[PDB]
Paper text:
Replication of the FMDV genome is mediated by a viral RNA-dependent RNA polymerase (RdRp), named 3Dpol through a negative-sense RNA intermediate. RdRp uses VPg as a primer for both minus and plus strand RNA synthesis. The first step of the viral genome replication consists of the successive incorporation of two uridine-monophosphate residues to a highly conserved tyrosine residue (Tyr3) of VPg. This reaction, termed uridylylation, is also catalyzed by 3Dpol using as template a small stem-loop structure (cis-acting replication element (cre) or 3B-uridylylation site (bus)) that is located within the 5′-untranslated region.
Among them, 5-fluorouridine triphosphate (FUTP) is a potent competitive inhibitor of VPg uridylylation in vitro and also behaves as a potent mutagen for picornaviruses including FMDV. To gain insight into the role of FUMP-VPg1 in inhibition of further uridylylation, we co-crystallized 3Dpol in the presence of the modified 15-mer peptides FUMP-VPg1 and UMP-VPg1. Tetragonal crystals of the 3Dpol complexes were obtained in both cases. Analyses of the electron density maps showed that the VPg1 peptides could not be traced in any of the complexes, most likely due to disorder. However, best-fit structural superpositioning showed that 3Dpol crystallized in the presence of FUMP-VPg1 exhibited a large conformational change in the β9-α11 loop, located at the N-terminal motif B. On the contrary, the structure of 3Dpol in complex with UMP-VPg1 was practically identical to that of the apo form. Motif B is formed by a “loop-α-helix” structure located at the base of the template channel and is involved in ribonucleoside triphosphate (rNTP) recognition, template binding and translocation of the nascent dsRNA. In the apo form of 3Dpol, the β9-α11 loop is packed against the fingers domain, forming part of the template channel and participating in template binding. But in the presence of FUMP-VPg1, loop residues from Ser298 to Thr303 in this motif B appear displaced by 7.8 Å towards the active site, thereby closing the template channel and preventing the correct positioning of the nucleotide template in the active site pocket. Large movements of this loop have been observed ranging from an open conformation, in which the loop is packed against the fingers domain, leaving the active site cavity accessible for template entry, to a closed conformation where the loop is found inside the catalytic pocket, resulting in a conformation that sterically clashes with the template nucleotide. The structural data shown in this work, together with previous evidence of VPg fluorouridylylation, prompt us to speculate that the inhibitory effect of FU on VPg uridylylation might be explained by the stabilization of the β9-α11 loop in the closed conformation, thus preventing the correct positioning of the template nucleotide in the active site cavity of 3Dpol.
Numbering used by the authors: 1 to 476
Write the structure that this text describes.
Amino acid sequence: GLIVDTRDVEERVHVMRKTKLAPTVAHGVFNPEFGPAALSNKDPRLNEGVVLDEVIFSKHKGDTKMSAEDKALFRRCAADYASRLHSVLGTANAPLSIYEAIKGVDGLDAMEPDTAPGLPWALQGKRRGALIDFENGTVGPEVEAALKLMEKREYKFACQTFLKDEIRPMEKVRAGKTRIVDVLPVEHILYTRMMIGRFCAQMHSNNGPQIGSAVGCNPDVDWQRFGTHFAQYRNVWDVDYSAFDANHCSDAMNIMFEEVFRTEFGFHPNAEWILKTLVNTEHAYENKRITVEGGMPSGCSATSIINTILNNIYVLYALRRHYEGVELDTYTMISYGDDIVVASDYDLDFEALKPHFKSLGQTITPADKSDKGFVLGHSITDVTFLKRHFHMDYGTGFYKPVMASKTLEAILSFARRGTIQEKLISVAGLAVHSGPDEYRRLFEPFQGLFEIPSYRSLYLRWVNAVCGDAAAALEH
């Protein structure tokens, strides 16, 4: 995005805390090159002269202006992807009821009852529970009033900026590259869910290469589905972006929203409008109010679908800008926000697409970290997606999501205080795919102190999870 105004203000949005993450017993064994992100300017691990306030917003270097020809190409690519999307999903996109918006529907989780409420409710000491009855799926009078302002397209708002208290590579910790989440007002989230919730549910239910989205996938079971699909292609690419979310230009975002969320596809006219409120945003951080043009508000969960849709349109755009006769079936892909796997039987030159992605304000590199850029001949067993590799289990022949051992060492090395037992059982579910020897090694530090699930128990759970009849067949 482009920072068009930075001004000081009364009311500090107090967003410089201490980490709830503490080292575990594993920290001293593994000595990871990771640590909690800096949550304070006075953090002694920060490099000399690094200001948190400056670095967290440094990703906003501009709002790339696309030419008329490029915008008309982008619109064709958006309308072509939308055609595919709404063909698979259908056009049952009537607004969600307030009850359904809060409680969710099949394929869409209920709203979180006690997460951050956003502005100005955070400054008035009003928690989410004060504004919305999540039990009954009803709203208080303030949310009710704000919903009626959005009906009229008169709603205005500020994004509350929170630092992401999490583990980061030590080099990113020192450089002050703390990640941020933009918390929009709870009523804005409610209304967005009203406008596109049915669509969001359908995309979760229909995740797969056909719609180019892994949002709402279960890697445990869906790696088999994904792996057998990409294994069929001569060429597979994993594509790295630099600040994908920030670098979505106003032109791209606006056109995507216009082509994807049309009334003719069953959407309320206001679906396009509430999404378009994401383009030109005001961000509250401490005493600062930063106005940005372009980019998606920072996040993962809340913005996954939009980022995934843009990734799909970007690949069609980039290939059509370089080659003639490119259609959706020229390649296959799956995306989860900025994360992407692309495959084609065609020898697509991804190295030559770099300038074409640059016309969208996006910088692509091979995920590989090759000294050269993109190459042909890569397969599904070479790539990373959701921090997971695709490897066949020798026992069953099924693809399993294998995470890098260094990443599992880092995850096991820190925990929120009092959560260690819960975290071990969760991370065991990830580490089981590393094999029995590495699984044993990763949890050795915790043996005798916590309950570590047997490798055997999680392996048997997994085989049943991915194919029920296969597990049954082994008792022939």
